[PDB]
């Protein structure tokens, strides 16, 4: 393994990633791999995310609307057999950044819909003076 | 009809069609969906896709190998079937903003590969004295 966690988000939540969760891993030092840094041409989305999930520890998924939207896709597509998706799997961590209706989600994305239903996720909590706890279960699922 | 033409493409991509495309079309009197910027609130982005090449008289997809990574997973997999992009259809217009080998498109984006290979698209030449050439095929499609 060459990374602690890939993280896997959409631009739509880059400033939050980019503001508390990257600097929260770093200070604890916690190596991540990104598309921005990774990603290389001649090669497909499908490869490089491929690359990324087999060096890291963990892979992180950053869920919210816009992630289903936009970055899902691939990963029903590519990824549905993965052990990274398969239920009793110690390597994913499931961040809900912002609440998803299960009925927001396209029909196509059977997986998806698989591991809402699961409730595996870490929530990111409205109130500030609970946050902390947020960082707690992260902690605790590296650390 | 309320648009002559939709527009799939990149944000990464979208200087060139801000500055070159889109201004070429307005210019002409051709109303212009796009399923972003022509925005519907209330709808996947499925149902906005769908929703603005029923509208449109022609689609145009502005393809790149940031388009293949970014944009096409949902057409493979909730568009494939459509009269759209079937073989010998008036109204598709491909153009090739950057070159696409063969081996960056992942294998399960069949019909993306089948596109590819009717070698039907017009494409953005370096060399400026080539444009309007392009230009010119541009307006043909459309009048």
Same mark, same amino acid.
């Given at each position: 393994l060459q990374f602690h966690a890939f993280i896997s988000y959409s631009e739509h939540d880059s400033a939050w990633v980019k503001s508390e969760l990257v600097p929260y891993l770093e200070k604890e030092d916690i190596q991540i791999c990104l598309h921005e840094r990774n990603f290389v041409p001649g090669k497909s989305i499908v490869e490089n995310i491929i690359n990324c999930i087999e060096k890291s520890y963990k892979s992180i998924f950053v869920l919210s609307p816009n992630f289903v939207q936009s970055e899902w896709c691939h990963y029903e597509l590519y990824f549905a057999h993965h052990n990274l998706f398969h239920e009793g799997s110690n390597?994913?961590?499931?961040? %809900?950044?912002? !609440?998803?209706?299960?009925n927001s989600i396209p029909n196509?994305?059977?997986?998806?819909?698989?591991?809402?239903?699961?409730?595996?996720? %870490?929530?990111? !909590?409205?109130?500030?003076?609970?946050?902390?706890?947020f960082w707690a279960n992260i902690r605790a699922a590296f650390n």
């Open positions: 390597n994913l961590i499931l961040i %809900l950044l912002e !609440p998803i209706p299960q196509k994305y059977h997986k998806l819909k698989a591991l809402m239903t699961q409730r595996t996720y %870490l929530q990111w !909590p409205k109130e500030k003076s609970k946050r902390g706890l």
